[PDB]
Amino acid sequence: VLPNPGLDARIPSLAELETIEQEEASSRPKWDNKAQYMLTCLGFCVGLGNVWRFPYLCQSHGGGAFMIPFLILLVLEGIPLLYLEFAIGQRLRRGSLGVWSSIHPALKGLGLASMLTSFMVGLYYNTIISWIMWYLFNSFQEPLPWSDCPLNENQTGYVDECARSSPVDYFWYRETLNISTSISDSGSIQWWMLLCLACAWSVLYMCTIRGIETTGKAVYITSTLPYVVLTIFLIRGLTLKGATNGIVFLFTPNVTELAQPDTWLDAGAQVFFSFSLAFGGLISFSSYNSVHNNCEKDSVIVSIINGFTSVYVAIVVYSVIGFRATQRYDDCFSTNILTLINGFDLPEGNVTQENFVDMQQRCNASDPAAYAQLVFQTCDINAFLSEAVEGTGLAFIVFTEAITKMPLSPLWSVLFFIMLFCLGLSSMFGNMEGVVVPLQDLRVIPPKWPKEVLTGLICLGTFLIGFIFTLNSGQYWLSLLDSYAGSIPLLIIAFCEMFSVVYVYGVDRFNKDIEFMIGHKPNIFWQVTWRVVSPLLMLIIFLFFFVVEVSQELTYSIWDPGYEEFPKSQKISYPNWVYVVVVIVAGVPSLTIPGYAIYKLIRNH
């Protein structure tokens, strides 16, 4: 509908597509088998970003009050983009940068914003992978290192930090992070973290050395292992003592928070992180398929798996959440029993959870003075299930503590960190695709040089940038990417992709194109979502996102041993300078879209 002259010149002819598959055998990569492409899409739409983020956001809002908005926006904003990206890649036979540049020369900014976004989400997820590897390397020890505390110079006093907190909390914050007390206290590089980061980048390079020539064989183990191990852990999680307690707890959501715009905004932005939309890897990967490949059926199959896996992983987390809360309730309970048995010297086993409050009174009446000094605890289990976990605690605090309480704890630790490592890797193949393909399409390195050279330099460059997260104050920096700074760009790119395919390229041409590729015009579901539903929803979510999420003062959680109510949470304000960083990390990619477009319409004059 917007005037676009010269489009037919830039893009391949519809008749030329019939004479391209058997004559472009060289120069362009090809999937060996449909299975390789489907396993790549599985690993990028159900890697981390689905399996890592979703469960955290479930327990940070409400077990079931978040899945409802998530599954609504999956259908109405996610499936439509997923199909659109698959189809446009398959049609125009190019990556994100090739695709948007050919639909209109002013939209090369859309492709540069996807490469930067992909860069930034790769930098984030590979730090998470370096932590996962640290924990996998410490998982070959009968007593897992996070099961006990270190002693003092007297070798008779437990470390005060561990004593005040826990063996796990201390292994995370002190033995892994060696965390400082604020983002301003940079400290120095944790050498053992640096070795883990090098390991993460180096394994990624081994798998991505010749793009899909190498990543397509990697996905046979990397997109199949996670799903079997997540099935095993589902069974073990369900067989837990309190497992069902958490399972019932995520399927009884409070509806008072289903009316909270933050639940809608997080679900909004999670749909684009879950599917790896607006990164540009999906467009590149779909561009290597046959022109007669059914991209509609693929988008639907991937989607169904994405939604089903989101709800499945929420069951595996909450079974473990339920297990932790129940072993707390019991513990706390067993100590309230032990206070009056030690105060009134009652026979052990006489006072039980069944007969406790009665005994409290029977004893209070007997000796109220001898009952007053008996400090007790008020611990209902609904207060334990609804105890939110800040940061990466669900992985390195809740799941790690629960694995130590299981028998053969070292075999469950290795399976858990191998599952997460493969998910990380599968996701990292897409994010690397979304940085490598654009740099190939910017012709910045000598064409003569093998891709191996370009892939290697991206791995070294990003490895060196990731030294900031190896600092004493690294987690604090990684938590800035967890801010709205990590999401605004994704919402802007997704909108612009939808808008440009429907109004700059034309939805009518796009329907004739799909009709050519798969044999039928997309039905009225796709039409409504592509022309109104998806676009409007994306705009609204972007508008309200700034109304509250962006407006709210950026705060973060510090781990200070020297703090009153120490093992409890002290959120502070980030310095003024930090906010500038959030602006550049989110603004540059977003502003690349218009910035490049305005550059192109003042070079024309």
Binding site: M133, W134, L136, F137, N138, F140, Q141, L195, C196, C199, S202, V203, Y205, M206, I209, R210, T214, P450, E452
Partner: peptide, 29 residues
């Protein structure tokens, strides 16, 4: 260190894989 020795083994096999893979490409002529 157990973590260190496991790390070393993983690194070794990974770098060996990388070397084999790059050499495999050199072999491809």
């Amino acid at each position: 260190s157990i973590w260190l020795i496991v790390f070393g083994v993983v690194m070794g096999v990974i770098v060996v894989g990388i070397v084999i893979l790059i050499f495999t490409g050199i072999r491809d002529r």
